[PDB]
Design a protein around this ligand. Structure first.
Ligand SMILES: [Mg+2]
Ligand SMILES: [Mg+2]
Ligand SMILES: [Mg+2]
Ligand SMILES: [Mg+2]
Ligand SMILES: [Mg+2]
Ligand SMILES: [Mg+2]
Ligand SMILES: [Mg+2]
Ligand SMILES: [Mg+2]
Ligand SMILES: [Mg+2]
Ligand SMILES: [Mg+2]
Ligand SMILES: [Mg+2]
Ligand SMILES: [Mg+2]
Ligand SMILES: [Mg+2]
Ligand SMILES: [Mg+2]
Ligand SMILES: [Mg+2]
Ligand SMILES: [Mg+2]
Ligand SMILES: [Mg+2]
Ligand SMILES: [Mg+2]
Ligand SMILES: [Mg+2]
Ligand SMILES: [Mg+2]
Ligand SMILES: [Mg+2]
Ligand SMILES: [Mg+2]
Ligand SMILES: [Mg+2]
Ligand SMILES: [Mg+2]
Ligand SMILES: [Mg+2]
Ligand SMILES: [Mg+2]
Ligand SMILES: [Mg+2]
Ligand SMILES: [Mg+2]
Ligand SMILES: [Mg+2]
Ligand SMILES: [Mg+2]
Ligand SMILES: [Mg+2]
Ligand SMILES: [Mg+2]
Ligand SMILES: [Mg+2]
Ligand SMILES: [Mg+2]
Ligand SMILES: [Mg+2]
Ligand SMILES: [Mg+2]
Ligand SMILES: [Mg+2]
Ligand SMILES: [Mg+2]
Ligand SMILES: [Mg+2]
Ligand SMILES: [Mg+2]
Ligand SMILES: [Mg+2]
Ligand SMILES: [Mg+2]
Ligand SMILES: [Mg+2]
Ligand SMILES: [Mg+2]
Ligand SMILES: [Mg+2]
Ligand SMILES: [Mg+2]
Ligand SMILES: [Mg+2]
Ligand SMILES: [Mg+2]
Ligand SMILES: [Mg+2]
Ligand SMILES: [Mg+2]
Ligand SMILES: [Mg+2]
Ligand SMILES: [Mg+2]
Ligand SMILES: [Mg+2]
Ligand SMILES: [Mg+2]
Ligand SMILES: [Mg+2]
Ligand SMILES: [Mg+2]
Ligand SMILES: [Mg+2]
Ligand SMILES: [Mg+2]
Ligand SMILES: [Mg+2]
Ligand SMILES: [Mg+2]
Ligand SMILES: [Mg+2]
Ligand SMILES: [Mg+2]
Ligand SMILES: [Mg+2]
Ligand SMILES: [Mg+2]
Ligand SMILES: [Mg+2]
Ligand SMILES: [Mg+2]
Ligand SMILES: [Mg+2]
Ligand SMILES: [Mg+2]
Ligand SMILES: [Mg+2]
Ligand SMILES: [Mg+2]
Ligand SMILES: [Mg+2]
Ligand SMILES: [Mg+2]
Ligand SMILES: [Mg+2]
Ligand SMILES: [Mg+2]
Ligand SMILES: [Mg+2]
Ligand SMILES: [Mg+2]
Ligand SMILES: [Mg+2]
Ligand SMILES: [Mg+2]
Ligand SMILES: [Mg+2]
Ligand SMILES: [Mg+2]
Ligand SMILES: [Mg+2]
Ligand SMILES: [Mg+2]
Ligand SMILES: [Mg+2]
Ligand SMILES: [Mg+2]
Ligand SMILES: [Mg+2]
Ligand SMILES: [Mg+2]
Ligand SMILES: [Mg+2]
Ligand SMILES: [Mg+2]
Ligand SMILES: [Mg+2]
Ligand SMILES: [Mg+2]
Ligand SMILES: [Mg+2]
Ligand SMILES: [Mg+2]
Ligand SMILES: [Mg+2]
Ligand SMILES: [Mg+2]
Ligand SMILES: [Mg+2]
Ligand SMILES: [Mg+2]
Ligand SMILES: [Mg+2]
Ligand SMILES: [Mg+2]
Ligand SMILES: [Mg+2]
Ligand SMILES: [Mg+2]
Ligand SMILES: [Mg+2]
Ligand SMILES: [Mg+2]
Ligand SMILES: [Mg+2]
Ligand SMILES: [Mg+2]
Ligand SMILES: [Mg+2]
Ligand SMILES: [Mg+2]
Ligand SMILES: [Mg+2]
Ligand SMILES: [Mg+2]
Ligand SMILES: [Mg+2]
Ligand SMILES: [Mg+2]
Ligand SMILES: [Mg+2]
Ligand SMILES: [Mg+2]
Ligand SMILES: [Mg+2]
Ligand SMILES: [Mg+2]
Ligand SMILES: [Mg+2]
Ligand SMILES: [Mg+2]
Ligand SMILES: [Mg+2]
Ligand SMILES: [Mg+2]
Ligand SMILES: [Mg+2]
Ligand SMILES: [Mg+2]
Ligand SMILES: [Mg+2]
Ligand SMILES: [Mg+2]
Ligand SMILES: [Mg+2]
Ligand SMILES: [Mg+2]
Ligand SMILES: [Mg+2]
Ligand SMILES: [Mg+2]
Ligand SMILES: [Mg+2]
Ligand SMILES: [Mg+2]
Ligand SMILES: [Mg+2]
Ligand SMILES: [Mg+2]
Ligand SMILES: [Mg+2]
Ligand SMILES: [Mg+2]
Ligand SMILES: [Mg+2]
Ligand SMILES: [Mg+2]
Ligand SMILES: [Mg+2]
Ligand SMILES: [Mg+2]
Ligand SMILES: [Mg+2]
Ligand SMILES: [Mg+2]
Ligand SMILES: [Mg+2]
Ligand SMILES: [Mg+2]
Ligand SMILES: [Mg+2]
Ligand SMILES: [Mg+2]
Ligand SMILES: [Mg+2]
Ligand SMILES: [Mg+2]
Ligand SMILES: [Mg+2]
Ligand SMILES: [Mg+2]
Ligand SMILES: [Mg+2]
Ligand SMILES: [Mg+2]
Ligand SMILES: [Mg+2]
Ligand SMILES: [Mg+2]
Ligand SMILES: [Mg+2]
Ligand SMILES: [Mg+2]
Ligand SMILES: [Mg+2]
Ligand SMILES: [Mg+2]
Ligand SMILES: [Mg+2]
Ligand SMILES: [Mg+2]
Ligand SMILES: [Mg+2]
Ligand SMILES: [Mg+2]
Ligand SMILES: [Mg+2]
Ligand SMILES: [Mg+2]
Ligand SMILES: [Mg+2]
Ligand SMILES: [Mg+2]
Ligand SMILES: [Mg+2]
Ligand SMILES: [Mg+2]
Ligand SMILES: [Mg+2]
Ligand SMILES: [Mg+2]
Ligand SMILES: [Mg+2]
Ligand SMILES: [Mg+2]
Ligand SMILES: [Mg+2]
Ligand SMILES: [Mg+2]
Ligand SMILES: [Mg+2]
Ligand SMILES: [Mg+2]
Ligand SMILES: [Mg+2]
Ligand SMILES: [Mg+2]
Ligand SMILES: [Mg+2]
Ligand SMILES: [Mg+2]
Ligand SMILES: [Mg+2]
Ligand SMILES: [Mg+2]
Ligand SMILES: [Mg+2]
Ligand SMILES: [Mg+2]
Ligand SMILES: [Mg+2]
Ligand SMILES: [Mg+2]
Ligand SMILES: [Mg+2]
Ligand SMILES: [Mg+2]
Ligand SMILES: [Mg+2]
Ligand SMILES: [Mg+2]
Ligand SMILES: [Mg+2]
Ligand SMILES: [Mg+2]
Ligand SMILES: [Mg+2]
Ligand SMILES: [Mg+2]
Ligand SMILES: [Mg+2]
Ligand SMILES: [Mg+2]
Ligand SMILES: [Mg+2]
Ligand SMILES: [Mg+2]
Ligand SMILES: [Mg+2]
Ligand SMILES: [Mg+2]
Ligand SMILES: [Mg+2]
Ligand SMILES: [Mg+2]
Ligand SMILES: [Mg+2]
Ligand SMILES: [Mg+2]
Ligand SMILES: [Mg+2]
Ligand SMILES: [Mg+2]
Ligand SMILES: [Mg+2]
Ligand SMILES: [Mg+2]
Ligand SMILES: [Mg+2]
Ligand SMILES: [Mg+2]
Ligand SMILES: [Mg+2]
Ligand SMILES: [Mg+2]
Ligand SMILES: [Mg+2]
Ligand SMILES: [Mg+2]
Ligand SMILES: [Mg+2]
Ligand SMILES: [Mg+2]
Ligand SMILES: [Mg+2]
Ligand SMILES: [Mg+2]
Ligand SMILES: [Mg+2]
Ligand SMILES: [Mg+2]
Ligand SMILES: [Mg+2]
Ligand SMILES: [Mg+2]
Ligand SMILES: [Mg+2]
Ligand SMILES: [Mg+2]
Ligand SMILES: [Mg+2]
Ligand SMILES: [Mg+2]
Ligand SMILES: [Mg+2]
Ligand SMILES: [Mg+2]
Ligand SMILES: [Mg+2]
Ligand SMILES: [Mg+2]
Ligand SMILES: [Mg+2]
Ligand SMILES: [Mg+2]
Ligand SMILES: [Mg+2]
Ligand SMILES: [Mg+2]
Ligand SMILES: [Mg+2]
Ligand SMILES: [Mg+2]
Ligand SMILES: [Mg+2]
Ligand SMILES: [Mg+2]
Ligand SMILES: [Mg+2]
Ligand SMILES: [Mg+2]
Ligand SMILES: [Mg+2]
Ligand SMILES: [Mg+2]
Ligand SMILES: [Mg+2]
Ligand SMILES: [Mg+2]
Ligand SMILES: [Mg+2]
Ligand SMILES: [Mg+2]
Ligand SMILES: [Mg+2]
Ligand SMILES: [Mg+2]
Ligand SMILES: [Mg+2]
Ligand SMILES: [Mg+2]
Ligand SMILES: [Mg+2]
Ligand SMILES: [Mg+2]
Ligand SMILES: [Mg+2]
Ligand SMILES: [Mg+2]
Ligand SMILES: [Mg+2]
Ligand SMILES: [Mg+2]
Ligand SMILES: [Mg+2]
Ligand SMILES: [Mg+2]
Ligand SMILES: [Mg+2]
Ligand SMILES: [Mg+2]
Ligand SMILES: [Mg+2]
Ligand SMILES: [Mg+2]
Ligand SMILES: [Mg+2]
Ligand SMILES: [Mg+2]
Ligand SMILES: [Mg+2]
Ligand SMILES: [Mg+2]
Ligand SMILES: [Mg+2]
Ligand SMILES: [Mg+2]
Ligand SMILES: [Mg+2]
Ligand SMILES: [Mg+2]
Ligand SMILES: [Mg+2]
Ligand SMILES: [Mg+2]
Ligand SMILES: [Mg+2]
Ligand SMILES: [Mg+2]
Ligand SMILES: [Mg+2]
Ligand SMILES: [Mg+2]
Ligand SMILES: [Mg+2]
Ligand SMILES: [Mg+2]
Ligand SMILES: [Mg+2]
Ligand SMILES: [Mg+2]
Ligand SMILES: [Mg+2]
Ligand SMILES: [Mg+2]
Ligand SMILES: [Mg+2]
Ligand SMILES: [Mg+2]
Ligand SMILES: [Mg+2]
Ligand SMILES: [Mg+2]
Ligand SMILES: [Mg+2]
Ligand SMILES: [Mg+2]
Ligand SMILES: [Mg+2]
Ligand SMILES: [Mg+2]
Ligand SMILES: [Mg+2]
Ligand SMILES: [Mg+2]
Ligand SMILES: [Mg+2]
Ligand SMILES: [Mg+2]
Ligand SMILES: [Mg+2]
Ligand SMILES: [Mg+2]
Ligand SMILES: [Zn+2]
Lengths: 122, 118, 59, 16, 204, 131
RNA sequence: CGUGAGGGAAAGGUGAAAAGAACCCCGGGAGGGGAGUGAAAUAGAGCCUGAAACCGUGGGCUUACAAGCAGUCACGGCCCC
RNA sequence: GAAUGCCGGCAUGAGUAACGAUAAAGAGGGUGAGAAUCCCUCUCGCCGUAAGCCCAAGGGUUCCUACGCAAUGGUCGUCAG
RNA sequence: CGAUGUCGGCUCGUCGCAUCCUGGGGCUGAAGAAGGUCCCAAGGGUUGGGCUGUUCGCCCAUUAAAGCGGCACGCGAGCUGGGUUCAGAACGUCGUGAGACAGUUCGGUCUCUAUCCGCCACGGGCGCAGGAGGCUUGAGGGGGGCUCUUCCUAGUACGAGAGGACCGGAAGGGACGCACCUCUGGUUUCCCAGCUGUCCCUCCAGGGGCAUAAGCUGGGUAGCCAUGUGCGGAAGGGAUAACCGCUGAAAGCAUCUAAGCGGGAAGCCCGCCCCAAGAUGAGGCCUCCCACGGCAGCCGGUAAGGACCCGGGAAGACCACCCGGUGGAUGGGCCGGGGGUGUAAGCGCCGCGAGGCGUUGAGCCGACCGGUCCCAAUCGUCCGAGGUCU
């Protein structure tokens, strides 16, 4: 349940460390983003010499949320942070690794490369 | 809303209402019959019925439970030794409320008697 | 607020039409089956002390 | 406020 | 246009094809027919259904004669299903089989005197920045001298709920004829124990 | 009628008894049937159970684990048919029914608070001596 | 009323005579009902006369599909002389 | 017949707002024509660098006791400054 | 001018259409895709943020789109009070001065009680020619009315290529709406536990008060809920707008028109959901009581029925509605289950002790699902037809 102003950790090696959502790219006026949803974000904190630097406007797909997400089988899953992976307009990850587990909902929405690069898919 | 909620409020906050029920418990279990307002009377039934039931059980734990509300050790003795045996075969219903036909002059409050049963 | 106030004195007709709902209803009374006095139903009789056939209270 | 002293109607309490 | 009277019993969820489907459970039948409305006699087509047996010691003579002409035991509720003429003289849950879709009509829960924010989702007022006793208040209710009045139908506070509600196109998840049970996916108006009417859907 | 009994009747077809008993504080491994891409595998989720909310057939429980540096809680319906089996891995002794407080604890702070439930461990080993 | 200088009200009438109502009744009293006084007691002390607004009881006529500065002109109905 | 006239009386708003700190009450027994409200007992709660005690100023019989309840007391009153 | 509160914001809408989007079109310097321009269309929609008191505007990130105006520059007996707009103070400027400035700067009292109309809700009365209990018809109202992405057709038609369709068919969304509490997530003022200081009961042990109108902390049922769940917008029929025709004169040709007949919009009428016979035009159907006693009328005793009273209710401000009232499971108790808490007290054992272990998932235990006449709904009263006329 990400919205504008929400800070997210980056679970990849793009060099970003923290991004702050400024749009949830879901139609005219979506209030919140969840796992699988693309946001626009400003890079608030990055490590030196990375692909992205502080102040860049990037796109990212949400991979972990602290709000639990529900499933048709009656179960739910919830993470200890809100995390995202920075992407390009073809939805591919802009870095080469992704860190921590990601939600299986990514596979459905079509983020195949992130799922395979993820150490665990819960 | 108030849907499916149990428990009158009686325009008393939490600790006053519990004090209210305890003091009527003491007065009822002391005199066998008291007069209150009909609403208070109706709420008393449950609060004293549970205390009497514990007295019927008679064990030290029951006594200490009853002590939390009633406090007075002599009064608990009367309840364990003289009151509870009257009810050994009564399956609940140790109190009755009957409505009085006149009201208080100073506020028109409708009055009732609460008494222990035989 | 800005202190609302009656615009016109209420007429004798209008004030009294407001009160077409103010008449008391008489007390509902039944005879006590014991002493035959008139009393409210579902209350212990104040004249002889009976209810449900038995004596319950001193009058 | 009307009130204080620039305006003078509709708007504040008793004083006169 | 098939229909049947029922009582809402409560909600749960069952598992069907590795999916959890929220259901509300309805005790529908059996519903004896006690009168039929004919175009010759009444001007329309409907069945008056009975539901739930009643202590005859509670049923007055005018009602008792209505049941008598039907040859039906005294029953607690009479409701008509419009444009429904069942072949039998008793309607049961088996007029629905799983997969069909229904509309369910109940009496919604009653909120009594509901403020403008619960009844109409108004935005209220601010809770700080100087807001003065208007936190749950509706704001303006009009214009000025033109039109100098308040529209009919203005959204204001007042009683809310305890009113007839039909929620439409509910999947019938199961029927348990042995017990007159009817499982339906989703939510149904009113409290447990409330009376509901289950009708074949009007959506396509 | 008895509305509660009728609902229990509806649920009875789905009630399970094959699963083992456990308690908040018990470490547990849920073998769970997930679907991925086109096929269905069995994914194990092993962690401490931090909550068991009871509503008969509708009871659910929450299992907490740390995966690759990240806390992950997973809520399972206790009578779900997607649960293949549940393996007790350890028995901890909790002091309270809900264990949310372990979320703000280090690994050793947890180990100090949830020590091995030696009693129920012997109960387990005393069982499984069925012959 | 104002610290003070100072400001500054309202309030007249039983009856010729108290003959101002013993005593009895209901009521804790107030109050009243009889008895009694008087030419008179709606002259009974909350007292001569006792207007009007205002309030109430009883009766006649009237009114719950109706648009009103409230009246006025006409006809009809009911009530009264 | 009008002067936001003056004096007085009586209306409307209205059986409406309110009855003045959210420290809090309950029962039993008395007294009495009448008692939630007075007296007594038990239980409960509140203050305790005071919401206890002693001076000073100011107030001026408000003190004590008996007998009272029309008015004063924001209700009641058998109680009371 | 014996006062018509003055900008903007917020809240709440509602209307216009010179239409921002969505729907339908003609022309195009329209290959396709995408535009341009004009016509029809007001059903619905028309985002979040940085700056500024701002309206406006610029900018960021999106969007189908980020429309323009009216309603006393809509709306201060609805809120705000940043600005403007008294008294204080200062700067620049003007004035010898006192002072002055749609110039700037910092500060600066916004009135508990709604009589009438209107509006939202809810009753009381009478009426609907006999009186009653039920079930209904729907005149006439109201609600709703949005839209996008991807895929298939098809890398097809079109195009040198880049690019890339109509028609038709699937799947998934956003915002909004109604209901709901199974799940997720809240609350849960005493449902359970732990904890400090203090006073008390009774010394230990065990408890009670107070620390808030829960002392604090960890949890938490039902209910009420959204962040959670289901469902909705339609489909379909009809009549139309612009626009396009068929047949066809006047006018041997031509012409959508003068006779006649087609097609054709998210819009109009139905259809869906809700209210509704005070619809005084007071409707309809099923059933019940009936020719009561006294001089279209009167007074009485009743009938079918109803009310009063009482036990209550996911109904509710009072009223109303609904259920029940001993031939009874309505509330209260009690029992069983659920649920919460998480292993009571007491005793025994280990330890110098704080404690620990066992008895023990114990003990306590609101509302939830039920059972049980133990307690209370005792006993009753009062209304209530005899049917006007051709
Ligand atoms: Mg990380
Ligand atoms: Mg990293
Ligand atoms: Mg860098
Ligand atoms: Mg920086
Ligand atoms: Mg689900
Ligand atoms: Mg990346
Ligand atoms: Mg992998
Ligand atoms: Mg409410
Ligand atoms: Mg409330
Ligand atoms: Mg209940
Ligand atoms: Mg309570
Ligand atoms: Mg109160
Ligand atoms: Mg109070
Ligand atoms: Mg009080
Ligand atoms: Mg009160
Ligand atoms: Mg307290
Ligand atoms: Mg006594
Ligand atoms: Mg008393
Ligand atoms: Mg009382
Ligand atoms: Mg003992
Ligand atoms: Mg207890
Ligand atoms: Mg009684
Ligand atoms: Mg009474
Ligand atoms: Mg009194
Ligand atoms: Mg009084
Ligand atoms: Mg105000
Ligand atoms: Mg104010
Ligand atoms: Mg006022
Ligand atoms: Mg005036
Ligand atoms: Mg007047
Ligand atoms: Mg008059
Ligand atoms: Mg009058
Ligand atoms: Mg009036
Ligand atoms: Mg009158
Ligand atoms: Mg009134
Ligand atoms: Mg009267
Ligand atoms: Mg003023
Ligand atoms: Mg439930
Ligand atoms: Mg099935
Ligand atoms: Mg029923
Ligand atoms: Mg219902
Ligand atoms: Mg219904
Ligand atoms: Mg309801
Ligand atoms: Mg609801
Ligand atoms: Mg509100
Ligand atoms: Mg709301
Ligand atoms: Mg609501
Ligand atoms: Mg609502
Ligand atoms: Mg609504
Ligand atoms: Mg808001
Ligand atoms: Mg807002
Ligand atoms: Mg708010
Ligand atoms: Mg607030
Ligand atoms: Mg203010
Ligand atoms: Mg206000
Ligand atoms: Mg406030
Ligand atoms: Mg308002
Ligand atoms: Mg105005
Ligand atoms: Mg205005
Ligand atoms: Mg007008
Ligand atoms: Mg209602
Ligand atoms: Mg509705
Ligand atoms: Mg569907
Ligand atoms: Mg059944
Ligand atoms: Mg249930
Ligand atoms: Mg761990
Ligand atoms: Mg330990
Ligand atoms: Mg152990
Ligand atoms: Mg003086
Ligand atoms: Mg002076
Ligand atoms: Mg003086
Ligand atoms: Mg003077
Ligand atoms: Mg004088
Ligand atoms: Mg005089
Ligand atoms: Mg004289
Ligand atoms: Mg003379
Ligand atoms: Mg005498
Ligand atoms: Mg006497
Ligand atoms: Mg006497
Ligand atoms: Mg006396
Ligand atoms: Mg006298
Ligand atoms: Mg008298
Ligand atoms: Mg006299
Ligand atoms: Mg004489
Ligand atoms: Mg003479
Ligand atoms: Mg006289
Ligand atoms: Mg005279
Ligand atoms: Mg005279
Ligand atoms: Mg006089
Ligand atoms: Mg004279
Ligand atoms: Mg005189
Ligand atoms: Mg006079
Ligand atoms: Mg006179
Ligand atoms: Mg009169
Ligand atoms: Mg009269
Ligand atoms: Mg008419
Ligand atoms: Mg008439
Ligand atoms: Mg005139
Ligand atoms: Mg006239
Ligand atoms: Mg004429
Ligand atoms: Mg003149
Ligand atoms: Mg005037
Ligand atoms: Mg003058
Ligand atoms: Mg004057
Ligand atoms: Mg004067
Ligand atoms: Mg004067
Ligand atoms: Mg005067
Ligand atoms: Mg005078
Ligand atoms: Mg005057
Ligand atoms: Mg006066
Ligand atoms: Mg008057
Ligand atoms: Mg007056
Ligand atoms: Mg006056
Ligand atoms: Mg008055
Ligand atoms: Mg009143
Ligand atoms: Mg008023
Ligand atoms: Mg009021
Ligand atoms: Mg007031
Ligand atoms: Mg009041
Ligand atoms: Mg006050
Ligand atoms: Mg006071
Ligand atoms: Mg205070
Ligand atoms: Mg007070
Ligand atoms: Mg306070
Ligand atoms: Mg205090
Ligand atoms: Mg007491
Ligand atoms: Mg008392
Ligand atoms: Mg007392
Ligand atoms: Mg007393
Ligand atoms: Mg007494
Ligand atoms: Mg006595
Ligand atoms: Mg008193
Ligand atoms: Mg008294
Ligand atoms: Mg007092
Ligand atoms: Mg005393
Ligand atoms: Mg006591
Ligand atoms: Mg001290
Ligand atoms: Mg002293
Ligand atoms: Mg002195
Ligand atoms: Mg003095
Ligand atoms: Mg004395
Ligand atoms: Mg006095
Ligand atoms: Mg007095
Ligand atoms: Mg007196
Ligand atoms: Mg005296
Ligand atoms: Mg005096
Ligand atoms: Mg006084
Ligand atoms: Mg007094
Ligand atoms: Mg006072
Ligand atoms: Mg006395
Ligand atoms: Mg004294
Ligand atoms: Mg002016
Ligand atoms: Mg004036
Ligand atoms: Mg004026
Ligand atoms: Mg004025
Ligand atoms: Mg004015
Ligand atoms: Mg146009
Ligand atoms: Mg037009
Ligand atoms: Mg143009
Ligand atoms: Mg368009
Ligand atoms: Mg177009
Ligand atoms: Mg075009
Ligand atoms: Mg050309
Ligand atoms: Mg081109
Ligand atoms: Mg094109
Ligand atoms: Mg439009
Ligand atoms: Mg319009
Ligand atoms: Mg528009
Ligand atoms: Mg904007
Ligand atoms: Mg900022
Ligand atoms: Mg801004
Ligand atoms: Mg701006
Ligand atoms: Mg402007
Ligand atoms: Mg500007
Ligand atoms: Mg610019
Ligand atoms: Mg477009
Ligand atoms: Mg655009
Ligand atoms: Mg505008
Ligand atoms: Mg204009
Ligand atoms: Mg507008
Ligand atoms: Mg203008
Ligand atoms: Mg202007
Ligand atoms: Mg304006
Ligand atoms: Mg505007
Ligand atoms: Mg204002
Ligand atoms: Mg304003
Ligand atoms: Mg304004
Ligand atoms: Mg205004
Ligand atoms: Mg105003
Ligand atoms: Mg105004
Ligand atoms: Mg200001
Ligand atoms: Mg300010
Ligand atoms: Mg200002
Ligand atoms: Mg400015
Ligand atoms: Mg200078
Ligand atoms: Mg000069
Ligand atoms: Mg010069
Ligand atoms: Mg100079
Ligand atoms: Mg100026
Ligand atoms: Mg200036
Ligand atoms: Mg200016
Ligand atoms: Mg200048
Ligand atoms: Mg300038
Ligand atoms: Mg300035
Ligand atoms: Mg300056
Ligand atoms: Mg300041
Ligand atoms: Mg300023
Ligand atoms: Mg105020
Ligand atoms: Mg009013
Ligand atoms: Mg008016
Ligand atoms: Mg009525
Ligand atoms: Mg009515
Ligand atoms: Mg008729
Ligand atoms: Mg009839
Ligand atoms: Mg008839
Ligand atoms: Mg009826
Ligand atoms: Mg009925
Ligand atoms: Mg109907
Ligand atoms: Mg209609
Ligand atoms: Mg009409
Ligand atoms: Mg319509
Ligand atoms: Mg509409
Ligand atoms: Mg539409
Ligand atoms: Mg293709
Ligand atoms: Mg093709
Ligand atoms: Mg080609
Ligand atoms: Mg291509
Ligand atoms: Mg298509
Ligand atoms: Mg809308
Ligand atoms: Mg809603
Ligand atoms: Mg609900
Ligand atoms: Mg639940
Ligand atoms: Mg929940
Ligand atoms: Mg939950
Ligand atoms: Mg407790
Ligand atoms: Mg302690
Ligand atoms: Mg303590
Ligand atoms: Mg101790
Ligand atoms: Mg204490
Ligand atoms: Mg204290
Ligand atoms: Mg306190
Ligand atoms: Mg505090
Ligand atoms: Mg406590
Ligand atoms: Mg808590
Ligand atoms: Mg919680
Ligand atoms: Mg709960
Ligand atoms: Mg719940
Ligand atoms: Mg709810
Ligand atoms: Mg939601
Ligand atoms: Mg057509
Ligand atoms: Mg042609
Ligand atoms: Mg042609
Ligand atoms: Mg033609
Ligand atoms: Mg046509
Ligand atoms: Mg065609
Ligand atoms: Mg549509
Ligand atoms: Mg149209
Ligand atoms: Mg209806
Ligand atoms: Mg009718
Ligand atoms: Mg109807
Ligand atoms: Mg009616
Ligand atoms: Mg009409
Ligand atoms: Mg008529
Ligand atoms: Mg008629
Ligand atoms: Mg008629
Ligand atoms: Mg009818
Ligand atoms: Mg009909
Ligand atoms: Mg009868
Ligand atoms: Mg009630
Ligand atoms: Mg009620
Ligand atoms: Mg009530
Ligand atoms: Mg009944
Ligand atoms: Mg009875
Ligand atoms: Mg009955
Ligand atoms: Mg029961
Ligand atoms: Mg029971
Ligand atoms: Mg109750
Ligand atoms: Mg259990
Ligand atoms: Mg349990
Ligand atoms: Mg232990
Ligand atoms: Mg133990
Ligand atoms: Mg122990
Ligand atoms: Mg030892
Ligand atoms: Mg331990
Ligand atoms: Mg347990
Ligand atoms: Mg218990
Ligand atoms: Mg239990
Ligand atoms: Mg209980
Ligand atoms: Mg159950
Ligand atoms: Mg139940
Ligand atoms: Mg039985
Ligand atoms: Mg009787
Ligand atoms: Zn009697």
């Amino acid at each position: 349940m990400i919205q504008p102003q929400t800070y997210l950790e980056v679970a990849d090696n793009t060099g970003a460390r923290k991004i702050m959502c400024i749009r949830v790219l879901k139609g005219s006026n979506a209030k919140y983003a969840t796992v699988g949803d693309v946001i626009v974000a400003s890079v608030k904190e990055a490590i030196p010499r990375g692909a992205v630097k502080e102040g860049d406007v990037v796109k990212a797909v949400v991979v972990r949320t602290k709000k639990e997400i529900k499933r048709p089988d009656g179960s739910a899953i919830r993470f200890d942070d809100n995390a995202a992976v920075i992407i390009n307009n073809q939805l591919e990850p802009r870095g080469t690794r992704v860190f921590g587990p990601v939600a299986r909902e990514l596979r459905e929405k079509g983020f195949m490369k992130i799922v395979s690069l993820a150490p665990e898919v819960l | 809303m108030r849907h499916l909620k149990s428990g009158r409020k009686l325009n008393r906050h939490s600790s006053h209402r519990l004090a209210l029920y305890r003091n009527q418990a003491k007065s009822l279990l002391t005199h066998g019959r008291i007069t209150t307002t009909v609403p208070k009377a109706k709420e008393l039934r449950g609060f004293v019925d549970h205390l009497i039931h514990l007295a019927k059980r008679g064990d030290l734990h029951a006594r200490r439970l009853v002590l939390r509300d009633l406090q007075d050790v002599k009064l608990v003795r009367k309840l364990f030794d003289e009151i509870a045996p009257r009810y050994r075969d009564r399956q609940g219903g140790y109190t009755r409320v009957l409505k009085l036909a006149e009201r208080r002059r100073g506020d028109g409050a409708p009055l009732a008697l609460v008494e222990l049963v035989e | 607020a800005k202190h609302p106030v009656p615009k016109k004195k209420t007429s004798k007709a209008r004030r009294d039409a407001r009160r077409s709902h103010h008449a008391l209803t008489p007390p509902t009374l039944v005879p006590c089956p014991e002493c035959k006095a008139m009393k409210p139903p579902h209350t212990v009789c104040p004249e002889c002390g009976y209810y449900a056939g038995r004596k319950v209270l001193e009058v | 406020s009307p009130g204080n002293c620039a305006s003078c109607s509709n708007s504040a309490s008793a004083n006169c | 246009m098939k229909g049947i009277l029922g009582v809402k019993v409560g909600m749960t969820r069952i598992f069907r094809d590795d999916r959890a489907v929220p259901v509300t459970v309805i005790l529908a039948g059996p519903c004896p027919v006690v009168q039929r409305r004919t175009p010759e006699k009444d001007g329309y087509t409907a069945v008056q259904l009975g539901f739930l047996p009643q202590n005859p010691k509670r049923v007055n003579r005018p009602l008792k004669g209505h049941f008598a002409k039907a040859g039906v035991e005294p029953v607690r509720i009479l409701r008509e299903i419009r444009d429904f003429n069942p072949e039998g003289d008793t309607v049961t849950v088996e007029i629905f089989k799983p997969g069909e879709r229904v509309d369910v009509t109940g009496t919604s829960k009653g909120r009594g005197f509901a403020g403008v924010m619960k009844r109409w989702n108004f935005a209220g007022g601010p809770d700080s920045h100087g807001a003065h006793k208007i936190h749950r208040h509706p704001g303006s209710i009009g214009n000025r001298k033109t039109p100098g009045r308040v529209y009919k139908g203005k959204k204001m506070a007042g009683h809310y709920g305890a009113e007839r509600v039909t929620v439409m196109n509910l999947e019938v998840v199961d029927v348990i004829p042995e017990e007159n049970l009817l499982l339906v996916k989703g939510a149904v108006p009113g409290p447990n124990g409330g009376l509901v009417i289950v009708r074949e859907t009007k959506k396509a | 009628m008895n509305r509660g009994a009728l609902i229990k009747l509806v649920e009875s077809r789905y009630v399970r008894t094959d699963l083992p008993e456990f308690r908040p504080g018990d470490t547990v491994r849920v073998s769970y049937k997930v679907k991925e891409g086109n096929r269905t595998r069995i994914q194990d989720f092993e962690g401490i159970v931090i909550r068991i909310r009871r509503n008969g057939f509708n009871t659910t429980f929450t299992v907490r684990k740390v995966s690759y540096g990240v806390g992950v809680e997973r809520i399972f319906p206790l009578h779900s048919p997607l649960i293949q089996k549940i393996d007790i891995v350890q028995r901890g002794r909790a002091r309270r029914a809900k264990l949310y407080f372990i979320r703000n604890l280090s690994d050793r702070e947890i180990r100090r608070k949830l020590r091995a439930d030696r009693k129920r461990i012997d109960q387990d080993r005393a069982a499984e001596r069925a012959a």
